[PDB]
Design an enzyme around this catalytic site. Structure first.
Site, PDB file in Angstrom:
ATOM      1  N   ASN A   1     -39.334 126.165  89.919  1.00  0.00           N
ATOM      2  CA  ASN A   1     -39.962 125.255  88.976  1.00  0.00           C
ATOM      3  C   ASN A   1     -38.998 124.529  88.048  1.00  0.00           C
ATOM      4  O   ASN A   1     -39.357 123.462  87.538  1.00  0.00           O
ATOM      5  CB  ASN A   1     -40.983 126.012  88.113  1.00  0.00           C
TER       6      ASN A   1
ATOM      7  N   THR B   1     -23.468 123.442 122.109  1.00  0.00           N
ATOM      8  CA  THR B   1     -24.843 122.965 122.116  1.00  0.00           C
ATOM      9  C   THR B   1     -25.082 122.146 123.376  1.00  0.00           C
ATOM     10  O   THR B   1     -24.348 121.191 123.648  1.00  0.00           O
ATOM     11  CB  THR B   1     -25.126 122.130 120.871  1.00  0.00           C
TER      12      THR B   1
ATOM     13  N   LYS C   1     -26.322 119.354 125.479  1.00  0.00           N
ATOM     14  CA  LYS C   1     -26.621 117.984 125.100  1.00  0.00           C
ATOM     15  C   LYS C   1     -26.991 117.177 126.333  1.00  0.00           C
ATOM     16  O   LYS C   1     -26.534 117.486 127.437  1.00  0.00           O
ATOM     17  CB  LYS C   1     -25.422 117.334 124.393  1.00  0.00           C
TER      18      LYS C   1
ATOM     19  N   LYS D   1     -29.657 116.284 122.981  1.00  0.00           N
ATOM     20  CA  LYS D   1     -30.510 117.185 122.211  1.00  0.00           C
ATOM     21  C   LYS D   1     -31.891 117.325 122.843  1.00  0.00           C
ATOM     22  O   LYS D   1     -32.406 118.439 122.987  1.00  0.00           O
ATOM     23  CB  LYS D   1     -30.625 116.689 120.765  1.00  0.00           C
TER      24      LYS D   1
ATOM     25  N   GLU E   1     -31.164 122.559 117.818  1.00  0.00           N
ATOM     26  CA  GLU E   1     -32.044 122.975 116.728  1.00  0.00           C
ATOM     27  C   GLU E   1     -33.423 122.328 116.791  1.00  0.00           C
ATOM     28  O   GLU E   1     -34.355 122.840 116.164  1.00  0.00           O
ATOM     29  CB  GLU E   1     -31.430 122.673 115.357  1.00  0.00           C
TER      30      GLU E   1
ATOM     31  N   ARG F   1     -28.965 126.556 110.308  1.00  0.00           N
ATOM     32  CA  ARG F   1     -29.190 126.127 108.933  1.00  0.00           C
ATOM     33  C   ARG F   1     -29.733 124.706 108.824  1.00  0.00           C
ATOM     34  O   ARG F   1     -29.411 124.001 107.861  1.00  0.00           O
ATOM     35  CB  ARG F   1     -27.901 126.263 108.122  1.00  0.00           C
TER      36      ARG F   1
ATOM     37  N   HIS G   1     -24.388 129.158 110.474  1.00  0.00           N
ATOM     38  CA  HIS G   1     -23.497 128.008 110.449  1.00  0.00           C
ATOM     39  C   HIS G   1     -22.917 127.865 109.049  1.00  0.00           C
ATOM     40  O   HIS G   1     -23.663 127.772 108.070  1.00  0.00           O
ATOM     41  CB  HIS G   1     -24.245 126.743 110.862  1.00  0.00           C
TER      42      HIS G   1
ATOM     43  N   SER H   1     -19.584 124.541 113.741  1.00  0.00           N
ATOM     44  CA  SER H   1     -20.108 123.576 114.693  1.00  0.00           C
ATOM     45  C   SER H   1     -20.111 122.187 114.072  1.00  0.00           C
ATOM     46  O   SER H   1     -20.202 122.034 112.852  1.00  0.00           O
ATOM     47  CB  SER H   1     -21.522 123.940 115.143  1.00  0.00           C
TER      48      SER H   1
HETATM   49  O1  LIG Z   1     -26.982 119.341 116.253  1.00  0.00           O
HETATM   50  C1  LIG Z   1     -25.740 119.168 116.296  1.00  0.00           C
HETATM   51  O2  LIG Z   1     -25.150 118.095 116.067  1.00  0.00           O
HETATM   52  C2  LIG Z   1     -24.916 120.397 116.678  1.00  0.00           C
HETATM   53  O3  LIG Z   1     -25.526 120.993 117.774  1.00  0.00           O
HETATM   54  C3  LIG Z   1     -23.509 119.911 116.985  1.00  0.00           C
HETATM   55  O4  LIG Z   1     -23.444 119.558 118.314  1.00  0.00           O
HETATM   56  P1  LIG Z   1     -22.055 118.539 118.630  1.00  0.00           P
HETATM   57  O5  LIG Z   1     -20.976 119.614 118.584  1.00  0.00           O
HETATM   58  O6  LIG Z   1     -22.302 117.871 119.967  1.00  0.00           O
HETATM   59  O7  LIG Z   1     -22.025 117.580 117.458  1.00  0.00           O
HETATM   60  C4  LIG Z   1     -24.920 121.366 115.474  1.00  0.00           C
HETATM   61  O8  LIG Z   1     -26.021 122.231 115.568  1.00  0.00           O
HETATM   62  C5  LIG Z   1     -24.944 120.609 114.123  1.00  0.00           C
HETATM   63  O9  LIG Z   1     -23.836 119.807 113.897  1.00  0.00           O
HETATM   64  C6  LIG Z   1     -25.053 121.630 113.012  1.00  0.00           C
HETATM   65  O10 LIG Z   1     -24.158 121.235 112.046  1.00  0.00           O
HETATM   66  P2  LIG Z   1     -24.281 122.282 110.647  1.00  0.00           P
HETATM   67  O11 LIG Z   1     -23.599 123.510 111.231  1.00  0.00           O
HETATM   68  O12 LIG Z   1     -23.538 121.578 109.533  1.00  0.00           O
HETATM   69  O13 LIG Z   1     -25.782 122.408 110.472  1.00  0.00           O
HETATM   70  O1  LIG Z   2     -45.142 127.062  86.306  1.00  0.00           O
HETATM   71  C1  LIG Z   2     -45.662 126.294  85.462  1.00  0.00           C
HETATM   72  O2  LIG Z   2     -45.079 125.792  84.483  1.00  0.00           O
HETATM   73  C2  LIG Z   2     -47.142 125.980  85.680  1.00  0.00           C
HETATM   74  O3  LIG Z   2     -47.806 127.184  85.887  1.00  0.00           O
HETATM   75  C3  LIG Z   2     -47.618 125.250  84.439  1.00  0.00           C
HETATM   76  O4  LIG Z   2     -47.757 126.161  83.418  1.00  0.00           O
HETATM   77  P1  LIG Z   2     -48.062 125.350  81.898  1.00  0.00           P
HETATM   78  O5  LIG Z   2     -49.313 124.580  82.309  1.00  0.00           O
HETATM   79  O6  LIG Z   2     -48.234 126.436  80.856  1.00  0.00           O
HETATM   80  O7  LIG Z   2     -46.841 124.479  81.691  1.00  0.00           O
HETATM   81  C4  LIG Z   2     -47.253 125.081  86.929  1.00  0.00           C
HETATM   82  O8  LIG Z   2     -47.217 125.872  88.088  1.00  0.00           O
HETATM   83  C5  LIG Z   2     -46.126 124.024  86.961  1.00  0.00           C
HETATM   84  O9  LIG Z   2     -46.321 122.956  86.095  1.00  0.00           O
HETATM   85  C6  LIG Z   2     -46.007 123.495  88.376  1.00  0.00           C
HETATM   86  O10 LIG Z   2     -45.584 122.189  88.257  1.00  0.00           O
HETATM   87  P2  LIG Z   2     -46.062 121.254  89.664  1.00  0.00           P
HETATM   88  O11 LIG Z   2     -47.569 121.403  89.517  1.00  0.00           O
HETATM   89  O12 LIG Z   2     -45.516 119.861  89.450  1.00  0.00           O
HETATM   90  O13 LIG Z   2     -45.452 122.039  90.809  1.00  0.00           O
HETATM   91 MG   LIG Z   3     -27.406 121.227 116.918  1.00  0.00          MG
HETATM   92 MG   LIG Z   4     -46.592 127.950  87.522  1.00  0.00          MG
END
Ligand SMILES: O=C(O)[C@@](O)(COP(=O)(O)O)[C@H](O)[C@H](O)COP(=O)(O)O
Ligand SMILES: O=C(O)[C@@](O)(COP(=O)(O)O)[C@H](O)[C@H](O)COP(=O)(O)O
Ligand SMILES: [Mg+2]
Ligand SMILES: [Mg+2]
Ligand SMILES: O=C(O)[C@@](O)(COP(=O)(O)O)[C@H](O)[C@H](O)COP(=O)(O)O
Ligand SMILES: [Mg+2]
Lengths: 447, 444, 444
Positions: B104, B154, B156, B158, B185, B276, B308, B360
């Site tokens: 929040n 990976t 390819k 994709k 992914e 990730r 990753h 990667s």
């Molecule tokens: O989706 C892709 O591009 C890859 O398969 C790379 O394949 P290439 O080696 O052919 O690029 C990887 O999963 C991402 O780069 C993840 O990067 P991160 O680890 O930063 O999420």
């Molecule tokens: O956590 C809080 O603060 C609340 O319970 C408000 O309490 P109060 O009403 O006492 O401030 C709400 O969940 C947030 O406003 C969420 O914001 P959104 O709805 O934009 O996710």
């Molecule tokens: Mg990938």
């Molecule tokens: Mg709340």
């Protein structure tokens, strides 16, 4: 031993196609790209479409094994800062928000080529939209199940945020419900704390909920927070909440993820529970206007996977918001066809394929003075959550809940005589407080 | 009880406080509004991620606030330190950590930007988490591969390849030298490649490649799906096909679903690689989001055999010094603070077994010497386009990468300076390996 | 509101309406009773399959009728086109289509004769269907047979054979050269031949032939029964015995039980052959019932790896022009309209995988040249009486059919015109295959 190009080529010679015309079965994504200096706009835009689709950083010999023009995405149009990209329907799994988000926003955000990237909007085709269940009950079933019509349903958030015990939690809940609030809710971080264990909180508050119902004559509820470490615990608390007689469960649908949220949604519908969704951790995505994902993309995803309520944020409260942006998000949830409005943040039209609407929930630091601004933006079909504006009353929760109910009911009734809310809300509230003592203290406290 | 809104600075700020060893410490790089001091902004984050609210509530008197409330104990000009009592958090749930700290407080009008830099998990809280199922040491034993970084790639493109063609591309990579491969992914279950056919096809390729090579092989089958039950069904199918590995997108799928899949994965004796995806929505910008070192801590706590970490010299953005700290944060038992590597706190892992880091991105043979320098031998190198982009197919590309890694490691074991002699080592190896020669003369 | 009886034309006949891409278009062959206009009958059938009834009701005003009503937008003299909106049909269920489209409408007095000729499934509604579990491409890899029609044969006589003797005929046919055999449509489990024994004996015959012939054989075991629970019990027993195939009478069993068995078959990994028994009562007459091209669309959506498309030259009726249309309606990704081929609407299959069309009937070697011409390389040719009717047994009959097909396809692959040289090709094959000679000179 077939031969191919085997080189490194720009992304814009096979993933930028300005003459393309998107189909009605294509996913359309609007991206707000900021390229690394020197790299042209139309080259980083093709990079985004390449790496959310069949592309990679080199030609690969496998490209000749399958046809690539049938599945590849292509940035079909650029309006200077916003790049439009069209994705084929064949690229996405049916009925899974995980895949539409594993692919579209998976790797395109961390590229060196793009300094910053935002997903402003996205068009979901009716073909893809129909593989999804949507909200379990929607607005109209929700109002009937509560037997409340022609009024923005109220609500409070039990405070302090953490620290209260199960016995003290239920006595505050009973105060708010007896005061006049139509509903209360657990706070998003209250799950099973060593001081407010869930198996005791669920049992305690429902005695308070059922006690208030027998004394007021209306139908109350309490959005029990059933989010937990795993889907198994999330379902166990959903099962216990149902057999206790509750009408509601609550899930932090972003911290708990989308797969767990979808799993809970199916279980919740099977148990006849109206499921409120809390958008905690959304502010990591949708805060900076140059990177992340806009909320209206998440608002589309929520209604797509199913949620009876969700927070759209309050414009005038203690959390950031824009009035034009929020109005578009409200109609993206509550309506069936949403025409594109450049002035309201929308880039595409949205045919909702008969999916049922979602209650927009206004939450934040809102007190009685925000009621005229809250009623106008949201109207009758919305939730107003007064967390600090109810317990913070100088005479307790019951006085605060009554004052909030009077303020909301007086303004909404005043809207019926045609009185202009944004020009006479102060006088309307003063007239109400002239005969409602509880509203008098609230008005002479916050200002 | 005195109603009325009061400044947050008076109750949730406490510089003289000394944090207990059982506290949950967090570091926030706050960028407040003009006219709002750091003290007001720092107390705003601590109050609103804890028992606080925007006003004074009568229900404050019902319990003891100081026992539970968070508080800011140190402000280093820009970074604000906050201590969270151990009683505020559920035992073993990442979700409660997420829904409390990073839930929040980011979206406030009075905080123009807020980035969680690093957070210290106490040993007491850490003891309630299971940790990775197998870890680095058991994995190496299971694959029977020692003394070198493991190789992957990976498959390819994709999306687009059919199940029959996908398994044919998988076979070429594994037969050509790569230890493992992986579903990309975004390839969960599509009309051109349904999951029940891809699982059965590529596992035939894995067993065929393994028999004709003599080494244990694997393929990180992507069991990510739209629901926990569906993912558990896909994980169960991969288990009884003989697969060693599964793969879940631990951020897009979620953390509750990830914890559910991890518990089932260890029952079937799998090794859960974690991807990730969507992390860059959080950790890209330096003024807003959540740094990946925090997301790297959480993954090890809940449990994941790989993760990753982001190659420094690839196509994906990533720092060099900060990635070194992440690699130490995922592999080592105790991680002392190091402001050079952005490690704000001292982290004790309390016997949680380590995690393979995975590098990667747009990496090829030329990046092998630098990669070995950073990650050492306990890491995965993934050549997605660096294998399939070879001018003679995947079998040559896998051989080129395998020769490049094995040559650079041998020189490092012989005492040569890798960072300075990478080009010479690669040239000397291509001098007797044509596959590496064609790979180098094509890239860079 | 006005209460009373009103003509159907006023509301449900909209010649100016333009169909949407999400509408469900149907083509009805209407024969109105003497004395009623065609459009009134066309409007009546549209209303009685939609929000309409025979009198104006007070409850119509409770809803926006124009958003849900079906309307007739084109009449071609005797064929009526009706547009059904997307909101009227439950997703993923064939049963709801037939409850609306082909439900009560076929029996009103005004419309004396009514036939459903074709219907267009919109991509939006089509996407909610699973499709065949394995399709064409995956199955050919599962059997390792490419570039020729696949040869099978029903086991005759239809009923009477005991479990041991039934497995003896299966062994002869499979050992003789057929690729599969199959149970007969009416042989579920009878006192003379029980399914526990038939399944076990046959799977011993399939494996023995599969081992001695070197290639993959099979048998489409009939798992049809009087309840879906029994069908799934038989489906599982067939699965754990090692069978590649199961067989379901998808019309007598019912579409719901078929959808249930298809889902379980994919989980068990069984290829699902579909038999169209009882279809004739639907599609035989040219002025009443449902055309089999609609049943072919319905089958492919709900699933099924094969369907009896019907042979033009056999003891079973069936046109040739429509047969090519159905074979394209099953195997092709996009099927353009062709009024001469019976197709009324353009069909987009939205990535659903194709289906083998199976040709069976009173066919023999003399029908092979015409059979290989209609269908081609992707179809099953079933020789029930053409395998056991051979004078020297079923092992010799299987070889005769296998030689006849493989010679014809090899003559087509070298440019020879099959329809003109079928006799010459078959005689050339028979001059070196004695088994083919006795089949040629007995059914000539
Ligand atoms: O989706 C892709 O591009 C890859 O398969 C790379 O394949 P290439 O080696 O052919 O690029 C990887 O999963 C991402 O780069 C993840 O990067 P991160 O680890 O930063 O999420
Ligand atoms: O956590 C809080 O603060 C609340 O319970 C408000 O309490 P109060 O009403 O006492 O401030 C709400 O969940 C947030 O406003 C969420 O914001 P959104 O709805 O934009 O996710
Ligand atoms: Mg990938
Ligand atoms: Mg709340
Ligand atoms: O029951 C039979 O006759 C068959 O076993 C053929 O045996 P023969 O080969 O000995 O005729 C087939 O199942 C039907 O012909 C199918 O009819 P359709 O093709 O119309 O489904
Ligand atoms: Mg038969």
């Amino acid at each position: 031993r077939a031969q191919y190009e085997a080189g490194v080529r720009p992304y814009r010679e096979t993933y930028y196609d300005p003459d393309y015309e998107p189909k009605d079965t294509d996913l359309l994504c609007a991206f707000r790209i900021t390229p690394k200096p020197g790299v042209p706009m139309e080259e980083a835009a093709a990079a985004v479409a390449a790496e959310s689709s069949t592309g990679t950083w080199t030609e690969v010999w496998s490209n000749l094994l399958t046809d690539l023009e049938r599945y590849k995405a292509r940035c079909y149009r650029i309006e200077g800062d916003v790049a439009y990209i069209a994705y084929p329907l064949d690229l996405f799994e049916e009925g899974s928000i995980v895949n539409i988000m594993s692919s579209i926003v998976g790797n395109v955000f961390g590229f060196k080529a793009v300094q910053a990237l935002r997903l402003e909007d996205m068009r979901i085709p009716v073909a893809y939209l129909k593989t999804f269940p949507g909200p379990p009950t929607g607005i109209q079933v929700e109002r009937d199940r509560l037997n409340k019509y022609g009024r923005p349903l109220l609500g409070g958030t039990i405070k302090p945020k953490l620290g209260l015990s199960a016995k003290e939690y239920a006595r505050v809940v009973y105060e708010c419900l007896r005061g006049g609030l139509d509903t209360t809710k657990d706070d998003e971080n209250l799950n099973s704390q060593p001081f407010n264990r869930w198996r005791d909180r669920f049992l305690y508050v429902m005695e308070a909920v059922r006690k208030a119902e027998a004394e007021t004559g209306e139908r109350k509820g309490h959005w029990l927070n059933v989010t937990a470490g795993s889907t198994e615990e999330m379902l166990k608390r959903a099962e216990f909440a149902a057999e206790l007689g509750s009408r509601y469960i609550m899930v932090d649908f972003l911290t708990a993820g989308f797969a767990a949220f979808a799993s809970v949604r199916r279980r919740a519908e099977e148990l006849g529970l109206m499921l409120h969704c809390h958008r905690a951790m959304h502010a990591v995505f949708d805060r900076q206007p140059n990177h992340g994902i806009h909320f209206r993309v998440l608002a589309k995803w929520l209604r797509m996977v199913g949620g009876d309520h969700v927070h759209t944020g309050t414009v005038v409260g203690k959390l950031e918001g824009d009035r034009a942006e929020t109005l578009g998000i409200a109609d993206l949830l509550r309506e069936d066809y949403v025409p594109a409005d450049p002035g309201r943040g929308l880039f595409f039209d949205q045919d909702w394929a008969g999916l049922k609407p979602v209650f927009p929930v206004a939450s934040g630091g809102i007190h009685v003075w925000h009621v005229p601004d809250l009623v106008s933006i949201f109207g009758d079909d919305a939730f107003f959550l007064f967390g600090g504006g109810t317990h913070g009353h100088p005479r307790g929760s019951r006085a605060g809940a009554t004052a909030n109910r009077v303020a909301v009911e007086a303004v909404v009734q005043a809207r019926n005589e045609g009185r202009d809310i944004l020009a006479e809300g102060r006088e309307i509230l003063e007239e109400a407080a002239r005969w409602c003592p509880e509203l008098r203290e609230a008005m002479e406290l916050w200002g």
